[PDB]
Design a protein around this ligand. Structure first.
Ligand SMILES: Nc1ncnc2c1ncn2[C@@H]1O[C@H](COP(=O)(O)OP(=O)(O)OP(=O)(O)O)[C@@H](O)[C@H]1O
Ligand SMILES: Nc1ncnc2c1ncn2[C@@H]1O[C@H](COP(=O)(O)OP(=O)(O)OP(=O)(O)O)[C@@H](O)[C@H]1O
Ligand SMILES: Nc1ncnc2c1ncn2[C@@H]1O[C@H](COP(=O)(O)OP(=O)(O)OP(=O)(O)O)[C@@H](O)[C@H]1O
Ligand SMILES: Nc1ncnc2c1ncn2[C@@H]1O[C@H](COP(=O)(O)OP(=O)(O)OP(=O)(O)O)[C@@H](O)[C@H]1O
Lengths: 16, 513, 534
């Protein structure tokens, strides 16, 4: 088998 | 329990009243509680009605309801602080009035949204601690509803937090009848419903429906009736003169059922009837002989103790009607399980797919008590070509093995195979596997042909006389399927040319065995 | 009333949607028009949602905005795509709730006799997708869906709102939203027909007619006949292109833009502009289902002898039989003859002359480099499409090239052969009729494979045999003068010939390259050299 490729990410912000 | 307006869930409410409020209604001295409920099911089954009526029936304070994920906030410590504001009154009453405290009901709608990363895990932990923590409460009830029960956190379902788990399902015919009665009582009371409408037919027809869909169907019927007194194109109108007299006929319900609402579930397709289209017409003795042999084989299979498995092969030339007679025998067998294996359902498959399909059919057959299976077009199943020749050996070996494997103890199986090439099968050494054989012949003489034409009734007397003059004094060799094809080809031309064309085609097809 | 008292269907400007709008009005607006007393007596609830969907450029947004215009109510609220998403946690749901806050306040204040509120969602699939089946990276989308579901129909009851939504891919929407009480009326918009095309064109030509800026040679009926598979947007673009072409005559450029003035007061749009734009500017996005018959028939058909007519007659007869028969819902026929005889063109002509709703041709020209499984899949797809229609016709040409036959060994693909046999044997669903026409050039090979008996009938397509037929063909083509024809006749008329028409055209073209004094001799030499045959 072939190992799953690399992937991007999304990000979320938080206030204080 | 129909007063609340929900039908088909009386038994669920009986279970509710047993498992929830028995301790609260039972005399306190002998007692000297449950604080979690989770309702799940497909959409539109009345969970919200259940929650609302549960809140109303008990003599307690007004329930508090949170609509979805309102708790989440952008700032730190607010999401968890929002949860602690819900239990303040409960804590106050527990600390002040002790045991003699009123019941508190909390309703969570779409609870899967907030139970299932800093915010969500903290919210779940705060809820878990508040429901079951160091301080123990005995006057709080929390209700949640879900449509996707498999997305809820496991830790929330343990005993002591969420105890009463309930499923709402699609109502059966009596529940549907109750729902239709509930939604049609208002119309019936005021005599706005026509006398031709029968609720029982509607209940029988509306299969796989839910309550919301039934109410929508009723609404569609009302709209169909109402539009009769509405005018458009130039301006919107109410009529009034005829609108005052509005009756809901059966045609409105039928039309609403055709298009406006749909069950939204799958359908089943049947193919067996396709294997006999023109029926069986007796044009001679051989058909009766074949049917008698089939009956003998069926009876032998039924009443045999040490021969539970029996096999047969049907022989004949092409266009002779072999599959039709096999299907007729199978139908007359009157066995609980009957199936037909055909290559029409397997186009473009490889050997492995065909083997798996055949094995699945036989596996299904093995489960019953007495079964019958028919396989037709063997040469097409193990695709064969005279050049080389070439064929699939895997399917041949699978058939050879399956032809002599007995079913589990005490069960019966019958197998009927059809083919038009017997020498090939004899060469493959498979003709021995079968127990017996039967032969399906063609039409041999002209008297049988005339009888067949009489049964079909395509020609009148004048042309039949000439046909008898021509054919009666000679031997013929023709099938029935090809005969029908020839008749249909001949019928196309004008009435003058029909007989000559028909006999020309017959002379073209003439041959001898 | 709930309807603006100044209203009419004509001023809306919707061409081809007559049944759909009537159904929408019937199923969504009957309750609010009738007197309240009878509605209360019936005790029914009002609809709260509509779902429009269809292919691009068919009129969903136009319909929605016209509906918004038709009602007397507060100005509708529009959500332009995914303009609700935010990066701070918990702020999308606040945006969602801000939409319903006003309606909730008004309902709470006034009870059951309050006004109506309309909210329009465009590209709804962007925000509403299945909660379970989505990128499991952030939980914003699922919370948005849950908030919307709770707000539309929650524990608290809101009954003075109507929500409209339009999309291009209905399937992706989560099922829990498409149930009665949230969105039950689900309409479909599709490509119009000839009557709808005429209505749309008349709608878009009215102002030009009113001010006398349209020529009298323009015939809208012929235009509607020609524009097959066009949609509303394309029908408007055609008019725009024609107007631009008409306008461009008065502007002179390539150094400075001058727009005349004297002749700019006598402008008109003729039919030449429409004819030019139909062929140079606008092409239908939907691929023409009509077969490109011009490719298969490239030089027409000429009656060089009797057999042609006979062949056509046979085909006609067969068509009749498959149209007026119930005992035999399936018919087959095979056309066979020597190479270069014109079997494909005759088969295409026979298929075209019929008026069946569905007609397709399966050729190996598209399956180049394909495996033996791709060919089976393609044939299965074509036959599956054929099964749908009530009356279907299919043409399978170049059967020997579809099986990869080579006489050395020989070699061929067996899977395709078996699939073809099974397809030929079976019948369509109940109450439907199918016709199949096959073409081949090697009949003995098919006989060896034992498939010649699967067909029902055969038709023979011979080639030129006598010199009279050759002279007739030359006369029909008209490539040689009378003087050359006399010389050619003086030799050919004596004996017989054996040549196909396609080869005849090739020979004529090769011959015409010589100088005028040599062309006849070249033609005769070629005919004598290559003509050695029965
Ligand atoms: N079993 C039922 N008996 C009577 N009415 C029903 C029933 N099921 C649904 N209805 C009708 O449907 C509406 C009630 O839907 P309700 O909000 O209770 O469903 P639900 O299961 O909570 O929905 P969802 O999971 O989609 O939020 C009312 O119109 C009620 O008349
Ligand atoms: N006595 C009969 N026996 C069999 N079929 C009959 C009879 N009378 C009418 N028929 C009709 O004739 C047709 C028989 O064709 P069928 O498909 O059974 O032939 P087949 O021999 O299996 O075909 P093939 O060898 O071409 O695959 C069916 O329409 C059947 O209804
Ligand atoms: N049936 C029609 N009658 C009249 N004009 C039409 C019709 N359909 C389309 N048009 C014209 O085409 C223009 C573009 O169509 P419209 O904006 O309604 O398409 P849409 O279906 O909402 O688009 P899409 O699916 O591509 O997002 C409309 O503004 C109108 O000018
Ligand atoms: N009377 C005619 N009948 C048939 N084709 C004709 C006739 N007159 C001209 N033609 C042209 O001759 C050609 C014959 O068609 P086509 O080239 O497909 O023949 P074919 O015999 O199927 O070819 P092939 O030998 O390459 O398999 C087409 O261009 C057709 O337009």
């Amino acid at each position: 088998m072939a190992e799953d490729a690399d992937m991007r990410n999304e990000l979320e912000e938080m206030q204080r | 329990f129909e007063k609340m307006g929900i039908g088909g869930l009386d038994k669920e409410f009986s279970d509710i009243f047993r498992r929830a409020f028995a301790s609260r209604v039972f005399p306190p001295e002998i007692v000297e509680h449950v604080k979690g409920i989770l309702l799940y099911g497909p959409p539109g089954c009345g969970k919200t009605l259940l929650a609302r009526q549960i809140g109303k029936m008990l003599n307690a304070r007004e329930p508090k309801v949170v609509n979805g994920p309102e708790i989440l906030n952008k700032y730190v410590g607010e999401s968890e602080a929002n949860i602690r504001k819900l239990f303040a009154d409960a804590e106050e009453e527990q600390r002040r009035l002790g045991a003699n405290s009123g019941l508190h009901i909390i309703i969570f709608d779409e609870i899967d949204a907030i139970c299932k990363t800093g915010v969500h895990d903290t919210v779940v932990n705060q809820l878990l601690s508040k429901i079951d923590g160091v301080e123990q409460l005995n006057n709080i009830l929390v209700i949640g509803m879900t449509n996707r029960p498999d997305l809820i956190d496991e830790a929330l379902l343990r005993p002591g937090r969420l105890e009463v788990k309930m499923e709402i399902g699609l109502p059966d015919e009596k529940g549907r009848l109750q729902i239709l009665h509930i939604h049609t009582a208002r119309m019936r009371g005021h005599q706005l419903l026509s006398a031709d409408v029968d609720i029982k037919e509607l209940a029988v027809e509306t299969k796989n429906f839910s309550g919301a869909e039934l109410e929508g169907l009723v609404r569609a019927a009302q709209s169909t009736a109402m539009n009769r007194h509405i005018k458009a194109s130039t301006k919107v109108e109410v009529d009034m003169e005829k609108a005052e007299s509005l009756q809901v006929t059966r045609g409105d319900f039928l039309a609403s059922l055709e298009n406006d609402i749909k069950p939204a579930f799958g359908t089943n397709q049947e193919d067996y009837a396709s294997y006999i289209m023109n029926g069986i017409i007796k044009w001679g003795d051989p058909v009766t002989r074949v049917l008698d042999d089939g009956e003998l084989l069926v009876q032998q299979t039924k009443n045999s103790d040490r021969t539970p498995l029996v096999s047969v092969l049907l022989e004949g030339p092409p266009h002779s009607g072999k599959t039709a007679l096999a299907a007729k025998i199978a139908e007359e067998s009157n066995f609980p399980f009957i199936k037909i294996c055909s290559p029409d359902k397997m186009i473009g498959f490889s050997e492995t797919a065909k083997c798996q399909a055949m094995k699945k059919i036989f596996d299904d057959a093995y489960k019953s008590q007495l079964s019958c299976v028919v396989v037709d077009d063997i040469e097409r199943l193990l695709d064969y070509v005279p050049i080389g020749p070439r064929f699939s050996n895997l399917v041949l070996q699978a058939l050879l093995v399956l032809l002599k494997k007995a079913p589990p103890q005490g069960r019966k199986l019958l197998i009927i195979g059809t083919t038009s090439r017997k020498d090939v099968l004899q060469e493959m050494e498979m003709l021995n596997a079968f127990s017996t054989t039967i032969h399906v012949p063609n039409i041999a003489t002209g008297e049988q042909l005339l009888e067949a034409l009489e049964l079909l009734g395509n020609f009148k007397d004048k042309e039949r006389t000439t046909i008898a003059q021509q054919v009666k004094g000679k031997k013929v060799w023709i099938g029935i399927k090809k005969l029908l094809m020839l008749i249909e080809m001949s019928l196309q031309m004008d009435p003058e040319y029909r007989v000559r064309k028909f006999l020309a085609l017959l002379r073209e097809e003439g041959a001898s065995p």
